[PDB]
Design an enzyme around this catalytic site. Structure first.
Site, PDB file in Angstrom:
ATOM      1  N   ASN A  46       0.908  -1.295  -0.015  1.00 23.14           N
ATOM      2  CA  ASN A  46      -0.046   0.080  -0.045  1.00 23.14           C
ATOM      3  C   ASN A  46       0.689   1.219  -0.139  1.00 23.14           C
ATOM      4  O   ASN A  46       2.027   1.252   0.212  1.00 23.14           O
ATOM      5  CB  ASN A  46      -0.971   0.045   1.275  1.00 23.14           C
ATOM      6  CG  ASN A  46      -1.867  -1.498   1.308  1.00 23.14           C
ATOM      7  OD1 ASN A  46      -1.757  -1.885   2.286  1.00 23.14           O
ATOM      8  ND2 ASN A  46      -2.438  -1.422   0.372  1.00 23.14           N
ATOM      9  N   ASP A  48       1.119   3.685   2.014  1.00 23.17           N
ATOM     10  CA  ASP A  48       1.692   4.229   3.414  1.00 23.17           C
ATOM     11  C   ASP A  48       2.847   3.357   3.544  1.00 23.17           C
ATOM     12  O   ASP A  48       3.413   3.384   4.603  1.00 23.17           O
ATOM     13  CB  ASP A  48       0.528   4.054   4.352  1.00 23.17           C
ATOM     14  CG  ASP A  48       0.096   2.582   4.619  1.00 23.17           C
ATOM     15  OD1 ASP A  48       0.524   1.747   4.252  1.00 23.17           O
ATOM     16  OD2 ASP A  48      -1.045   2.538   5.473  1.00 23.17           O
ATOM     17  N   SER A  50       2.664  -0.014   4.311  1.00 16.24           N
ATOM     18  CA  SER A  50       2.070  -1.236   4.848  1.00 16.24           C
ATOM     19  C   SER A  50       1.879  -2.365   3.790  1.00 16.24           C
ATOM     20  O   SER A  50       1.985  -2.023   2.734  1.00 16.24           O
ATOM     21  CB  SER A  50       0.841  -1.202   5.625  1.00 16.24           C
ATOM     22  OG  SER A  50      -0.356  -0.548   4.850  1.00 16.24           O
ATOM     23  N   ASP A  52      -0.596  -6.025   2.612  1.00 10.57           N
ATOM     24  CA  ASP A  52      -1.736  -6.797   2.817  1.00 10.57           C
ATOM     25  C   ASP A  52      -1.404  -8.235   2.573  1.00 10.57           C
ATOM     26  O   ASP A  52      -0.626  -8.553   1.675  1.00 10.57           O
ATOM     27  CB  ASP A  52      -2.917  -6.619   2.122  1.00 10.57           C
ATOM     28  CG  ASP A  52      -3.525  -5.082   2.374  1.00 10.57           C
ATOM     29  OD1 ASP A  52      -3.300  -4.437   3.561  1.00 10.57           O
ATOM     30  OD2 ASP A  52      -3.923  -4.497   1.218  1.00 10.57           O
ATOM     31  N   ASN A  59      -3.667  -6.602   6.852  1.00 11.25           N
ATOM     32  CA  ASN A  59      -2.874  -5.502   6.793  1.00 11.25           C
ATOM     33  C   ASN A  59      -1.828  -5.085   7.821  1.00 11.25           C
ATOM     34  O   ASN A  59      -2.011  -5.322   9.036  1.00 11.25           O
ATOM     35  CB  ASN A  59      -3.449  -4.021   6.643  1.00 11.25           C
ATOM     36  CG  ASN A  59      -2.581  -2.826   6.754  1.00 11.25           C
ATOM     37  OD1 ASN A  59      -2.301  -2.393   7.778  1.00 11.25           O
ATOM     38  ND2 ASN A  59      -2.204  -2.574   5.540  1.00 11.25           N
TER      39      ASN A  59
END
Ligand SMILES: [Cl-]
Ligand code: NA
Length: 129
Positions: A46, A48, A50, A52, A59
């Site tokens: 993602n 940011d 992070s 998944d 996440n």
């Protein structure tokens, strides 16, 4: 491992997902299909930073540790790699924590956009359950 639709349904039912917090089995199978295409090894990064992980795309910002998401939490108490296993136990246990946290299955963006308000029972139809 890439699950069959009915195979996964049966696995989830065994792990206590059917009707868990009021969500019929079809909701979980639908979410899995659209989050990961039933692939336990699915990963997605993602914006940011992070990531998944796994069949339910849990996440790393809140739920598991992957050693690369600064200032994240590990609320499921597990390494994120454990969510990629052929055995869905870790993903199930952690999903149960996520869906109990107040926002229900809305925490799964694909569920909200592609399963919510649809005939989710269709995802388990024909399965020997
Ligand atoms: Cl709810
Ligand atoms: Na984390």
């Amino acid at each position: 491992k890439v699950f069959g639709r009915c195979e996964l349904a049966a696995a989830m039912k065994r792990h206590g997902l059917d009707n868990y917090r009021g969500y019929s089995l079809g909701n979980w199978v639908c979410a899995a299909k659209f989050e990961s295409n039933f692939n336990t090894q699915a990963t997605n990064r993602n914006t940011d930073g992070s990531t998944d992980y796994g069949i339910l795309q849990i996440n790393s910002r809140w739920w598991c540790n992957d050693g690369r998401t600064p200032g994240s939490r590990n609320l499921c108490n597990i390494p994120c790699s454990a969510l990629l296993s052929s055995d869905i136990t870790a993903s199930v246990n952690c999903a149960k924590k996520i869906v109990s946290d107040g926002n229900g299955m809305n925490a799964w963006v694909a569920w909200r956009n592609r399963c919510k308000g649809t005939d989710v029972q269709a995802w388990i139809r024909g399965c020997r359950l």
